Design a protein around this ligand. Structure first.
Ligand SMILES: *C(=O)[C@H]1N[C@@](C)(CO)[C@](O)([C@H](Cc2ccc(F)cc2F)NC(=O)[C@H](Cc2ccc(F)cc2)NC(=O)[C@@H](CC(=O)N(CC)CC)NC(=O)CCCCC)O[C@H]1C
Lengths: 208, 231, 240, 212, 210, 232, 195, 227, 233
């Protein structure tokens, strides 16, 4: 069922710098694509991002459900929402349809604020199609192309890293993973968030 | 002060009696039943001249073989008429034959007392003069908010119903011809109006024994009846 | 039956007697102001003074935001306000869920006035004793401002004032308001009509609260004025 | 994993005339290859001038006949006249189609005499379709007897022709047909009830068939 | 095998009379055309009980609508009602196949309705096992502005040839004619036997070979 | 005074006024009378006629073979009770293929009286029923707006019932062990006593039921013959 | 089975689809009208699948969008129309599935001329061009080859003519008759083509 | 049968809610102080007969690890409100996996109180909660009313002679007050309010010391503070 | 209360809540409707505070469907609710019949709904009088009226709201059959201003055809009010 609209997402961490990336394919009947702009990354808060991989309708439906819940939370509390709270709420939503579930394997990527000045701690985690959370503290990968990404990251991860080197690392890992999957690819985007700014870049991938 | 279904000390329900008060005002109507068929009529209480007078109709048809004549709160009356024709077509679906008029008035009376929990909220405040033809023969029936229904050879409802019943008592006779019944109905109706009788000022319907079909008289038939009307 | 309050039941004159008492409750409340400006829409108000130990920082009890592009000012009972604020936020995010675009303010105020009309008509529950000055921006109609009431009536207003001494405030708005005007001029006029309504020559910075909504840089945002900013505004008002 | 359908087996024969209708049926109940009892009438009288016969599941036909008699009695109570056979036919059509998705295992025949002294005969399927006829048969033996009735009544593929038919010859033809079915089918029966309807009421006789 | 087409003097509707429980025919005479309204007819195909019950139900609802509103219903509205109610029983086992044809205020109109809510407007339709044969013969020899006699002859021959290569279809032909003021039954029922031995084997010598 | 606003309030004396008012509605209703002997229960009643053009209203009703009733009070309530009893007897004969026990049916309708008297926002029926049947014995039962039922040798309902009751207790001993004809005659004398202003074929109803005698209203000719016998 | 084609560029939009009413092995008609659903305003909905499913879904979506526009007295945005159709299709997919493809198109003041692909499992995304059915295989690569920025409506119609010629020549159902629906310059023009 | 017993009078004023405030004003007082590095809720309990034990009755409770509460009014109302507030904190923690914010809990309980004012066949709650807690956004102190409206305080008092206690607490209070001085001001405020003599088992105190669990002081610690 | 009868028969046999709804209607602003040949004119008054109120937000005169239109007088919130109900029923009819809803069906449905709320527990009557304008199924213009009691009838011309009797008396002695569009607009503007202060800003008039509803511009209304002001003086 995940061969229908195959996709992949990825996210790494570094020294006061975090990265998230995805492929831009939308499939139909497995072996014929229809679009090269379907971004699996969705901005949700000023320092929280979420990567949804799986069936496209379930990706979109889960995006609107989470956007509803999020914007409700910032409007009532009148303050910015935390990554852990969003992760727990996402796990509850995926569990709430434990039977007949959303066929989506999401991830969460963002920053953790520790007020005292303020320190931005990286945060990354991944989920099954039910909400099997597992904190990882380094590279997090999820999708049909997950095995190739797991293979690439350990060879290419260098612990904490500069944001430029992080972009090179995550870009090479994603491009080498997507080239070895037939139903995943067709371009890529790499979002590198920092406290000062976010850099969004698209890669000259084997989109063909 | 009190609920809808509160008995009086005399055993009468207050809401039912007040509903009987409401039917005392309204458009006068007259019904006659004879061997060859049934006749109904109404005074056609026209409003100001800007009204079309086609939409304002007092003689509707429950089915192909049933007519009616309303009195009292008219929106409630149309609700009762709608339920009646729905149930008659339900009979026509469940059973091939045409529904008897007695069963139709019984269902109408059953709906009228629906406010008593034994959903609606108060009595309908409507009096109907239903008429039709079936295998048993032509007949007409009377309905009122109290639920009792009584079957007639000739009757009337509305404002000038008492004088209409008196003239019908004086003039109606058994073994009557249908033309005699039509001229009798127009004589009684003309005597109980306020305005002079005319073509647009009156409406008539009838269900013949042979046709067994509802048929509202048009302007030509009404003028023909008026021209041969004694005075 | 014997203990019934006769809520959803017409008067002899056709008024229901309950929305009327709700409106007298509105007229005794603290005043709220509304203004539409070329740069934005403003919902200044007046705090009721309960005690000096109330937290001055934040504690915006009159103006609330329904979304990033919608925000309103309360002119009645606070609990009846806040439950309807929650319903409004629910309706906004529900429309964004259904259609994937922001809800126009006209749709939203139609929904709040519809649900308020329901308890006025259906059942035997009392109406909500609250009247809002809902304002916001949309691409269909731009900056708008409305006036809701417990009856479920709503009407558009370029500038209006509700609550106690609303006659004097509306007179000042009729005298001073202009079609095209700056945000600073609108804020100064808001201080002027608040001072006139409060029977004070100079407004007190602790006794008032201001907010504005501008579609600046193609991204609408709300600002809520702090004590220092209100002090600077009152200094400009005294200078002017 | 329980199938709520068994063919108890049987046959009901029907034939009409100018002013009469003849309906005949077995009096055997059975299971697949064994017989319960030698006397189980499937014909149920509905009105003074109408009867109904059936074949299939015994419980379904009993429930259907008693339900139809309930509806007829309620109709007479509410409306103060007996229902006609066409009325009963449409009522049975609506009753059968109410259970469309769990249908009655009952192939029905509805016989009687109209108000104009005409012997009618309606024949049914399990679901509710119905059509008037001058001859019909249902049950296990339906394929056996139905060509014979077509030869006798319609009498196509013939040139000399003979339409002179009366009540006794029609009855004797029905006795011959049910005897042939009893010889040529195992579920048919051992005693049969020849219901005859006329303007002067209803009469019922009984006949003894083979016991095998 | 049902049939319906539109021409200068209204609409002609033709049907067979067979009825099959499988390999065995239940009854050779039936009526597959119901007067749903005085000005509207409807053919019948597929499951007999389903189509019969649902056209009678539609006739009931049409009597409700006409008697309330005091206006004759159109064929489009009846077809839409039928397709809506049949779609509610989707995936349940119904096999209703219907061709609704009649005159209304718009004009002469014709619709096809199926168990799957398949409302299709047209001027020529045919449903059943022998639908293809009737379609073939009409589209070989159907034209607008031909006489009523030619139309009934064409419909009768099409129903005959549909019965000729279809065991499911047979019995008798019932050709009806719809016009402005209701309808008339041109052929109440006519045996296909003499029809065959008039059309294809006019000389009664030797078996016909094909 | 103020304890008659609702049906759920006991007075200081301890009386439901609404139920008493329903009984008052029964007492103002038209007449009826029933008599039984050893193997026959005869029922009769005066059919209301409000005008010379009006025809007589239905008074006697049929519920089931060998069971029938008569009416006095609100007619719509009688319609509801008749439909309930007809459905109950027909359902019993459906599911069990036997005639229903009559007193179980009487308890059922009395329960329907009770549940409407008891809960608020509902009214008791303004009608009493005169149930007559032959369940292997002639029997006459009674119902009241309160949940209650009693069994009688003879009974009367509403109108000038005092004259009828005086005649019945004056002649109760002779009702047992007399033929059906004299039984019908005595019932007509009781109704004529309730008249106090003449009995005719149109304005009276009559029904008979007994052993080997299902419930059947008497024809016009036989009723005219009995009326002429009463006149003579 | 039912071929739908769609193309979008600067200042035009084109939709296309075969005109065939298939039942079993035959055609009820060669001039079908059950596939296109005109919406009030510069909007349209093209459906493909079983006839009853597209009839119910298209009428339901069209008449609800009309209800929105009449109640609110404003023209619904194209993006709102597309995502509302997707949400309705997904909801009905989870309970009472509608096997029906989609091609939402329209014009908006804020977004301009735009098109949306959508599958029978509500697999929706904006595209400049797309197709549905088995004929999507034999026309989509043509659309890649001859599409370029700053296109015109006549060039688009030439591309559609090439696709129709290919579907007649090579596709198993040699589809001859087609119906088009062009949106440009605040007009909605319909054409009928027979290659 | 469900109809609003609470209704608008002429001039409104919500007379049942006014009677609920009259219930609160006659009930035993409670108070709370917000300090620089802590928050206090304190209340006096009536001078008990010897049969009562203070280890059973508790006007001070805890909803979560960091959140406390005190009331002044009907005890059963406080019990059901406390139980449902615990359920609200629990469902929020089940969803978002964290200790509940003070503001969200205050909003929900205010909405529930409004629902009971609005709902038919009921009467308002006859108490006035006083919730205190600590979270990411500093310390908070809130005050629920029978109306279902919440107010953010830095120091407040409830119950009998609440105006005089408010004035006294206004006289002796600073924004940068230490936690021990806040406790001393609470003791002096309730001592002025009681018009009698105090000791252990006559007063009860709850406090949250910095980012640590909410703590209820035993009688030994209060006796140490009284000296 | 919830599910109990609040409207009931008085001792005189009148449902007093319905007459109270009629006084609520009579306090509401006036409205007029005319028809002739193949079109209709709808007029409603207007009241706004100058320099503060936005005239665009007013929705006294509306469109229900492709052809049907509606005007009302009474409580505006109840009017909005019943308007949304009728629009829902219009699109429900158009999905179950595949023909646009005729004016007679919508007038009957509005009367049915108002009688339903008048004849059920837990709901008071809709305190509004509406009059619907639209084309019949046979392409015949007919305007319907509707009272809170559920009474409805078809009129050639009729008015509602404040001083409706005086306006209806005026229309009886000035209505003509098959008038021009300018003549109908002139007659409606005279009729509404018999009982309304003379100014262009106090009315919102529109004209209905088979194409669509078209609101008359401010300049034509200003010319018309000036012309009748000259005519009166
Ligand atoms: C034209 O092509 C022509 N073919 C046939 C004759 C083929 O059967 C038919 O489809 C016919 C319809 C018909 C028959 C009689 C009638 F009064 C009206 C009518 F519309 N079809 C059938 O009779 C059913 C065959 C069938 C087709 C499709 C299905 F999905 C299921 C069945 N047969 C019956 O209806 C049968 C019993 C039945 O309901 N079945 C089969 C067990 C389905 C549950 N009933 C009868 O034959 C008549 C009652 C019994 C008389 C003793 O019409 C046109 C198209």
């Amino acid at each position: 069922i995940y061969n229908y609209n195959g996709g992949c997402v990825l996210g790494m961490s570094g020294s006061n710098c975090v990265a998230i990336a995805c492929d831009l394919r939308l499939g139909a009947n497995t072996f014929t694509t229809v679009s090269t702009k379907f971004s699996k990354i969705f901005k949700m808060n000023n320092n929280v991002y979420v990567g949804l991989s799986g069936l496209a309708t379930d990706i979109q439906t889960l995006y609107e459900i989470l956007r509803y819940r999020v914007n409700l939370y910032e409007v009532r509390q009148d303050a910015e929402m935390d990554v852990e709270c969003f992760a727990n709420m996402l796990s509850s939503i995926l569990y709430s349809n434990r039977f007949s579930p959303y066929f989506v394997n999401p991830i969460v990527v963002g920053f953790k604020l520790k007020h005292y000045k303020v320190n931005y701690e990286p945060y990354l985690t991944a989920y099954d199609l039910i909400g099997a959370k597992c904190e990882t503290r380094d590279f997090v990968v999820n999708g049909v192309t997950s095995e190739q990404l797991f293979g690439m990251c350990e060879s290419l991860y260098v612990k904490d890293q500069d944001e430029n080197g992080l972009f090179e690392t995550i870009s090479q890992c994603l491009l080498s993973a997507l080239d070895r999957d037939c139903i995943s690819g067709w371009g890529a985007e790499v979002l590198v968030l920092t406290p000062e700014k976010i850099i969004k870049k698209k890669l000259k991938a084997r989109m063909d | 002060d009190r609920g809808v279904n509160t008995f009086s000390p005399e055993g009468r329900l207050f809401q039912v009696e007040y509903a009987l008060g409401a039917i005392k005002l309204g458009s006068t109507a007259v019904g006659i039943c004879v061997n060859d068929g049934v006749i109904l009529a109404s005074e056609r209480r026209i409003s100001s001249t800007l009204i079309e007078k086609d939409s304002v109709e007092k003689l509707l048809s429950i089915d192909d073989h049933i007519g009616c004549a309303m009195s009292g709160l008219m929106a409630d009356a149309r609700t009762l008429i709608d339920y009646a024709r729905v149930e008659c077509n339900h009979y026509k679906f469940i059973y091939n034959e045409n529904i008897n008029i007695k069963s139709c008035v019984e269902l109408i009376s059953e709906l009228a007392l629906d406010f008593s929990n034994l959903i609606m909220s108060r009595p309908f405040g409507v009096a109907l003069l239903i008429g039709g033809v079936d295998k048993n023969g032509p007949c007409l029936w009377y309905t009122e908010p109290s639920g009792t229904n009584t079957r007639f050879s000739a009757a009337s409802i509305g404002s000038a119903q008492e004088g209409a019943e008196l003239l019908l008592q004086e003039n109606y006779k058994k073994d009557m011809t249908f033309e005699q019944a039509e001229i009798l109905a127009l004589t009684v109706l003309r005597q109980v109006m306020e305005d002079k009788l005319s073509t647009s000022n009156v409406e008539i319907c009838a269900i013949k024994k042979s046709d067994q079909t509802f048929y509202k008289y048009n302007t030509d038939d009404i003028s023909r009846i008026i021209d041969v009307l004694p005075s | 039956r014997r203990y019934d309050s006769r809520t959803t039941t017409f008067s002899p004159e056709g008024r229901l007697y309950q929305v009327e008492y709700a409106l007298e409750a509105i007229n005794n409340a603290s005043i709220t102001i509304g203004l539409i400006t070329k740069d934005g829409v403003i919902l200044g108000a007046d705090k009721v003074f309960i005690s000096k130990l109330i937290d001055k920082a934040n504690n915006y009890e009159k103006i609330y935001k329904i979304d990033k592009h919608i925000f309103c000012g309360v002119a009645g009972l606070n609990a009846d306000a806040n439950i309807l604020i929650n319903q409004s936020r629910l309706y906004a995010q529900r429309y964004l869920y259904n259609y994937n675009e922001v809800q126009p303010v006209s749709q939203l105020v139609v929904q709040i006035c519809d649900i308020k009309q329901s308890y006025t008509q259906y059942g035997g529950l009392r109406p909500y004793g609250v009247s809002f000055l809902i304002g916001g921006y949309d691409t269909k109609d731009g900056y708008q401002l409305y006036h809701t009431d417990p009856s479920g009536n709503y009407s558009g207003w370029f500038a209006t004032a509700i609550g106690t001494n609303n006659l004097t405030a509306s007179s000042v708005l009729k005298q001073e308001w202009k079609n095209d005007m700056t945000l600073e001029e609108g804020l100064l006029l808001a201080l002027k009509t608040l001072a006139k309504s409060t029977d004070t020559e100079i407004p007190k910075s602790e006794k008032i609260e201001l907010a504005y909504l501008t579609n600046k840089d193609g991204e609408v945002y709300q600002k809520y004025l702090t004590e220092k900013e209100i002090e600077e505004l009152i200094k400009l008002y005294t200078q002017k | 994993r329980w199938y709520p359908y068994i063919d108890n087996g049987g046959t009901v024969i029907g034939l009409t005339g100018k002013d009469y209708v003849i309906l005949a049926a077995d009096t055997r109940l059975s299971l697949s290859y064994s017989i319960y009892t030698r006397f189980c009438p499937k014909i149920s009288k509905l009105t003074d001038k109408c009867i109904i016969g059936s074949s299939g599941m015994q419980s379904d036909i009993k429930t259907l006949h008693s339900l139809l008699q309930k509806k007829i009695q309620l109709f007479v109570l509410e409306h103060s006249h007996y229902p006609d056979i066409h009325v009963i036919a449409r009522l049975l059509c609506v009753i059968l189609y109410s259970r469309r998705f769990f249908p009655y295992y009952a192939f029905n025949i509805l016989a009687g005499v109209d108000e104009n002294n005409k012997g009618v005969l309606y024949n049914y399927d399990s679901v509710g379709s119905y059509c008037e006829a001058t001859h019909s048969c249902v049950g296990s033996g339906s394929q056996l007897i139905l060509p014979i009735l077509d030869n006798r009544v319609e009498q196509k593929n013939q040139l000399i022709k003979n339409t002179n038919f009366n009540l006794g010859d029609d009855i004797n033809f029905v006795k011959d047909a049910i005897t042939s079915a009893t010889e040529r089918d195992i579920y048919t029966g051992d005693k049969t009830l020849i219901y005859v309807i006329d303007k002067m009421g209803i009469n019922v006789n009984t006949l003894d068939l083979k016991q095998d | 095998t049902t049939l319906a087409f539109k021409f200068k003097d209204g609409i002609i509707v033709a049907v067979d009379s067979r009825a099959s429980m499988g390999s065995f025919i239940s009854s050779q005479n039936v009526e597959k055309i119901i007067e749903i309204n005085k000005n509207i007819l409807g053919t019948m195909a597929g499951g007999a009980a389903d189509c019969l019950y649902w056209e009678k139900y539609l006739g009931k609802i049409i009597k409700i609508y006409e008697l309330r509103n005091n206006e004759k219903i159109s064929v489009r509205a009846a077809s839409t009602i039928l397709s809506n109610i049949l779609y509610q029983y989707k995936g349940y086992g119904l096999c209703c196949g219907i061709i609704l044809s009649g005159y209304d205020h718009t004009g002469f109109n014709m619709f096809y309705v199926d168990d799957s809510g398949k409302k299709v407007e047209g001027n020529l339709f045919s449903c059943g096992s022998g639908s293809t044969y009737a379609y073939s013969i009409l589209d070989s020899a159907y034209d607008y502005n031909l006489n009523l006699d030619q139309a009934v002859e064409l419909a009768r021959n099409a129903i005959y040839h549909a019965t000729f290569r279809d065991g499911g279809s047979g019995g008798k032909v019932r050709v009806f004619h719809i016009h402005k003021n209701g309808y008339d039954k041109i052929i109440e029922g006519e045996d296909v036997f003499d029809l065959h031995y008039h059309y294809t084997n006019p000389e009664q010598k030797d078996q016909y070979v094909m | 005074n103020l304890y008659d606003t609702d049906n759920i309030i006991y007075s200081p004396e301890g009386r439901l006024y609404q139920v008493e008012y329903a009984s008052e509605a029964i007492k103002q209703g038209t007449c009826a009378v029933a008599i039984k002997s050893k193997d026959y229960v005869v029922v009769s009643g005066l059919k209301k006629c409000i005008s010379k053009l009006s025809f007589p209203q239905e008074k006697i009703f049929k519920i089931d073979d060998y069971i029938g009733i008569s009416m006095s009070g609100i007619t719509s309530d009688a319609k509801v009770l008749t439909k309930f009893m007809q459905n109950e007897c027909l359902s019993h004969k459906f599911l069990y293929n036997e005639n229903i026990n009559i007193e179980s049916l009487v308890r059922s309708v009395a329960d329907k009286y009770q549940k409407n008297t008891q809960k608020s926002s509902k009214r008791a029926f303004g009608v009493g029923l005169m149930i007559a049947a032959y369940h292997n014995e002639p029997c006459i039962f009674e119902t009241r707006p309160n949940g209650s039922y009693f069994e009688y040798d003879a009974l009367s309902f509403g109108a000038r019932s005092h004259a009828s009751k005086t005649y019945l207790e004056k002649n109760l001993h002779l009702f047992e062990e007399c033929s059906l004809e004299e039984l019908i005659l005595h019932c007509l004398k009781a109704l004529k006593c309730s008249l106090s202003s003449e009995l005719t074929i149109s304005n009276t109803a009559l029904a008979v039921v007994g052993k080997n005698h299902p419930w059947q209203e008497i024809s016009s000719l036989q009723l005219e013959e009995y009326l002429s016998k009463v006149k003579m | 089975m039912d071929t739908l084609i769609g193309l979008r560029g600067n200042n035009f939009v084109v939709l296309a689809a075969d005109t065939y009413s298939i039942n079993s092995i035959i055609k009820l008609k060669n001039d079908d009208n059950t596939k296109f659903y005109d919406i009030h305003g510069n909007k349209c909905l093209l459906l493909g699948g079983s006839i009853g499913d597209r009839l119910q879904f298209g009428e339901f979506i069209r008449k609800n969008v009309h209800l929105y526009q009449y109640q609110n007295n404003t023209d619904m945005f194209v993006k709102s129309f597309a995502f509302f159709t997707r949400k309705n299709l997904a909801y009905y997919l989870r309970r009472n599935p509608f096997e029906v493809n989609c091609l939402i198109a329209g014009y908006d003041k804020k977004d301009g001329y735009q098109l949306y692909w959508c599958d029978y499992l509500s697999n929706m995304d904006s595209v400049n061009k797309g197709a549905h059915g088995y004929g999507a295989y034999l026309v989509s690569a043509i659309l890649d080859k001859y599409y370029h920025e700053n296109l015109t409506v006549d060039e688009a119609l030439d591309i559609f003519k090439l696709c129709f010629e290919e579907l007649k020549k090579r596709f198993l159902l040699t589809q001859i008759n087609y119906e088009l629906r062009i949106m440009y310059d605040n007009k909605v023009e319909t054409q009928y083509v027979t290659v | 049968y469900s109809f609003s017993l609470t209704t608008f009078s002429p001039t409104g004023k919500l007379v049942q809610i006014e009677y609920a405030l009259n219930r609160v004003s006659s009930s035993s007082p409670a108070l709370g102080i917000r300090a620089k590095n802590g928050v206090i809720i304190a209340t006096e309990k009536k001078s008990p007969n010897e049969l009562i034990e203070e280890n059973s009755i508790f006007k001070i409770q805890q909803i979560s690890e960091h959140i406390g509460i005190v009331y002044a009014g009907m005890p059963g109302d406080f019990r059901v409100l406390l139980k449902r507030a615990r359920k609200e904190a629990i469902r929020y923690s089940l969803q978002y996996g964290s200790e509940i914010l003070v503001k969200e809990l205050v909003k929900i309980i205010a909405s529930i109180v409004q629902e009971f004012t609005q709902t038919g066949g009921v009467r308002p709650f006859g108490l006035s909660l006083l919730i205190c807690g600590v979270d990411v956004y500093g310390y908070h102190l809130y005050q629920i009313d029978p109306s279902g409206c919440y107010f953010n305080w830095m120091a407040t008092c409830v119950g009998k002679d609440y105006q005089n206690n408010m004035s006294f607490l206004e006289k002796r209070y600073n924004k940068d007050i230490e936690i021990e001085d806040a406790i001393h001001t609470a003791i002096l405020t309730l001592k002025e309010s009681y018009e009698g003599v105090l000791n252990e088992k006559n007063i009860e105190i709850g406090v949250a010391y910095d980012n640590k669990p909410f703590k209820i002081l035993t009688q030994n610690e209060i006796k140490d503070y009284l000296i | 209360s919830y599910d109990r009868a609040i409207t009931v028969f008085s001792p005189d046999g009148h449902l007093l809540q319905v007459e109270h709804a009629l006084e609520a209607v009579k306090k509401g602003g006036c409205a007029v409707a005319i028809k002739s040949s193949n079109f209709a004119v709808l007029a409603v008054e207007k009241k706004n505070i100058p320099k503060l109120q936005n005239p665009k937000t007013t929705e006294k005169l509306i469109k229900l469907d492709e052809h049907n239109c509606l005007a009302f007088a009474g409580l505006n919130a109840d009017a909005r609710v019943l308007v949304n109900k009728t629009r829902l029923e219009c699109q429900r009819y158009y999905l179950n019949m595949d023909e646009p809803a005729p004016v007679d069906y919508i007038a009957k449905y509005v009367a049915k709904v108002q009688q339903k709320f008048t004849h059920r527990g837990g709901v008071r009557p809709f305190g509004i009088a509406t009059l619907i304008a639209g084309f019949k199924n046979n392409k015949e213009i007919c305007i319907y009226q509707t009272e809170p009691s559920g009474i409805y009838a078809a009129w050639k011309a009729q008015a509602i709201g404040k001083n409706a009797k005086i306006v209806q008396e005026f229309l009886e002695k000035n209505y003509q059959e098959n008038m021009e569009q300018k003549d109908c607009i002139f007659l409606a503007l005279k009729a509404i201003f018999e009982v309304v202060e003379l100014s262009s800003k106090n009315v919102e008039v529109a004209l209905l055809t088979e194409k669509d509803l078209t609101f008359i511009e401010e300049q034509e209304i200003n010319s018309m009010v000036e012309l009748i002001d000259q005519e009166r003086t």
